[PDB]
Specification:
Family: Belongs to the bacterial solute-binding protein 3 family.
Number of domains: 2
Oligomer: monomer
CATH superfamily of the largest domain: Periplasmic binding protein-like II
CATH topology of the largest domain: D-Maltodextrin-Binding Protein, domain 2
Number of strands: 13
CATH architecture of the largest domain: 3-Layer(aba) Sandwich
Radius of gyration: 19 Å
Pfam families: SBP_bac_3
Keywords: Cell membrane, Lipoprotein, Membrane, Palmitate, Signal, Transport
Distance between the termini: 37 Å
Largest sheet: 6 strands, mixed
Organism: Bacillus subtilis (strain 168)
Subcellular location: Cell membrane
Length: 251
Amino acid sequence: TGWEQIKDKGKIVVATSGTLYPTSYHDTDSGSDKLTGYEVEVVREAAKRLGLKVEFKEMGIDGMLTAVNSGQVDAAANDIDVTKDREEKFAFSTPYKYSYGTAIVRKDDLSGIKTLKDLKGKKAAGAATTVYMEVARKYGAKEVIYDNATNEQYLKDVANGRTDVILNDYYLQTLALAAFPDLNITIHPDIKYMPNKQALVMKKSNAALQKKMNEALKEMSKDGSLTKLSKQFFNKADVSKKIDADVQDVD
């Protein structure tokens, strides 16, 4: 534990899942299977700025925070939201990603949806146990149960009229549109909910490491490195800066 200890070894141990495209995943398209992604690269470069090598320990989100407290790892980078509750238990770096949830509906009629309230009675699809599906339920949407579908399948069913809406992170959905620009789908222009931001998580007592990481992140923020990495993984979008938008809070 400790920044002087990390500095001495010359390596920082960081936990991540590798199952969250495009922020932490493996590059299978190239055949390298290299752990990469927006957040992974941000940490890698930040550590480099600090003369350090990174040792990424892949593990499930569960027990990850426990590994940080136990000292098993020096930090955890896995799209973890900054929340007041977590801030009393851990030390976060400055945020390097800001986002909010949105909805993908049909391009031709927006699936008859104008506001979140119109989700009532609509067929909502996507991951079963996420805060996104919870949002849909709160508004009375019918949850669609899929056996084992793909992203392309989910999107086509919306376009086809088999389903009506998909609730997910804004940036993840912009990639959906970019991937299938000819499909009858689009991100609803007025629905924005649950703003959120992600940062590096470390033991709250590790104030020295926290300050050093922020120092490198700030340097990256000022020279365009963050924006550069963002555009690479989020199809030219820059997720490192907060979007001045009318975002609705949800219970």
